[PDB]
Design a protein around this ligand. Structure first.
Ligand code: HEM
Length: 414
């Protein structure tokens, strides 16, 4: 029971007869974690900076009960690696108890070993570095086409649709063997499923996407294509279900496409804020071999991991994480430990890398090679194409939406 006589926070104050107290505990902690991972331009917000000073693991929130659950945030590099690498944390127990089945087939984030292990191993060959080498000429074409479109239009151009999404959409679709003719409509359907203010219309759009994808999976899984479905289907036969394949494909075209569009937009923004450094990349790329790792570290466009649930009492740093507690990891805090300082500032010439932008442990980014391929093609190509790239209006702040790192618009000229 919140006490609205004492405080002003709307989220904290929500109460009505018959409200679920546990649902409320989980939801306010998600909101708290989210608030902490907004950004101040490229930087952590003061609240996260303050929290980082407290120690490597702090209390996000606690349940009203005697011997109730605690939600923790890990911010120290040591604590984050320890949590994410430990077999004493479950991902699946976040979504239900032991006896609960899988909710979203193919949503790897939701699986624990041994089934996490098997399903990931089944799909891994499609995401390999070798496979990304093969995919590279297509990505190069996608990027040059996007740049041609931008240049043809004339400045100013919004790089969110014309750079982030113009690359992410065809790249993800092509990876899944989606015919060119279908792509614009699917992207439109996905927009409705991600943004429509009506939850009813949001679900109808999601349903429309998932049924297209189920059909596409059935058509493609026994075929001879180099798409994800052909690869995984030919290799695995009936060991992978249509539902599982559909989930993986949907993730790639939905959540993951959004993640890469956001990363590319954040990259283009950094380029216009740090043009002398990116001039070094354009003109002498061999002298800055760690540029990409440093960019990932600085940007950390996925600020935090999904909460993990402790399956037994476990020591994390100083603290005792009790069975049933959750720990959320701040990749942002892990990658920017020295914020603010000269050493934390973006430095394209840095050695040794860091970093944890793609997570850690068994759940670490399956799409790392694909994401890096996209970035490593896109950013240098942008630099060569528009050496004079700049903000159309240098006085206007970039508007950031809710995490993860969400550039809403990026109006650039050259
Ligand atoms: C199209 C490109 C991408 C694909 C296909 C992809 C795919 C995936 C998948 C399937 C997982 C779940 C792995 C598992 O649970 O075993 C994952 C996890 C993760 N990804 Fe990606 N990803 C992409 C881009 C990105 C980008 C741009 C970032 C941010 C830099 C990112 C950051 C992460 C992180 C931090 C995790 C771990 C989450 C956690 O531990 O809770 N990914 N990725």
């Amino acid at each position: 029971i919140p006490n609205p006589l004492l405080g002003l926070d709307s989220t904290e104050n929500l109460y009505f007869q018959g409200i679920d107290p546990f649902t409320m505990f989980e939801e306010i902690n998600v909101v708290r974690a989210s608030q902490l991972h907004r950004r101040d331009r490229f930087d952590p917000v003061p609240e996260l900076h303050s929290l980082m000073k407290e120690g490597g693991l702090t209390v996000l929130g606690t349940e009203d009960s005697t011997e109730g659950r605690t939600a923790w945030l890990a911010t120290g590099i040591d604590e984050v690696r320890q949590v994410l690498g430990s077999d004493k944390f479950s991902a699946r127990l976040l979504y239900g108890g032991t006896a609960a089945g899988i909710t979203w087939p193919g949503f790897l984030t939701q699986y624990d070993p041994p089934e996490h292990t098997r399903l990931r191993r089944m799909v891994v060959p499609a995401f390999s570095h070798r496979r990304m080498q093969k995919f590279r000429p297509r990505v190069e074409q996608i990027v040059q086409d996007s740049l041609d479109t931008i240049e043809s239009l004339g400045g100013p151009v919004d790089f969110v649709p014309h750079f982030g999404w113009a690359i992410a959409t065809p790249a993800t679709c092509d990876f899944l063997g989606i015919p060119r003719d279908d792509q614009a409509d699917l992207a439109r359907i996905l927009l409705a499923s991600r943004t429509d203010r009506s939850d009813k219309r949001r679900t109808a759009a999601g349903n429309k996407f998932m049924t297209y994808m189920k059909q596409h999976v059935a058509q493609s899984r026994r075929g001879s294509g180099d798409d994800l479905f052909g690869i995984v289907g030919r290799e695995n036969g009936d060991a992978i279900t249509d539902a599982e394949l559909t989930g993986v494909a949907a993730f790639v075209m939905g959540a993951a496409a959004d993640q890469v569009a956001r990363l590319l937009a954040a990259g283009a923004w950094l380029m216009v804020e740090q043009p002398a450094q990116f001039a070094l990349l354009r003109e002498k790329p061999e002298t800055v071999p760690e540029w990409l790792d440093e960019t990932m570290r600085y940007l950390t466009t996925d600020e935090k991991t999904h909460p993990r649930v402790a399956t037994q009492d476990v020591r994390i740093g100083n603290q005792l994480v009790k069975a049933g507690d959750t720990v959320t990891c701040s990749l942002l805090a892990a990658n920017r430990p020295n914020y603010p300082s000269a050493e934390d500032e973006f430095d394209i010439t840095r050695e040794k890398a860091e970093h944890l932008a793609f997570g850690h442990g068994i759940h670490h980014c399956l799409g790392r090679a694909m994401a890096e391929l996209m970035f490593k093609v896109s950013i240098p190509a942008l630099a060569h194409r528009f050496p004079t790239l700049r903000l159309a209006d240098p006085q206007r702040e970039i508007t950031l939406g809710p995490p993860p790192f969400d550039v809403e618009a990026l109006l650039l000229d050259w």
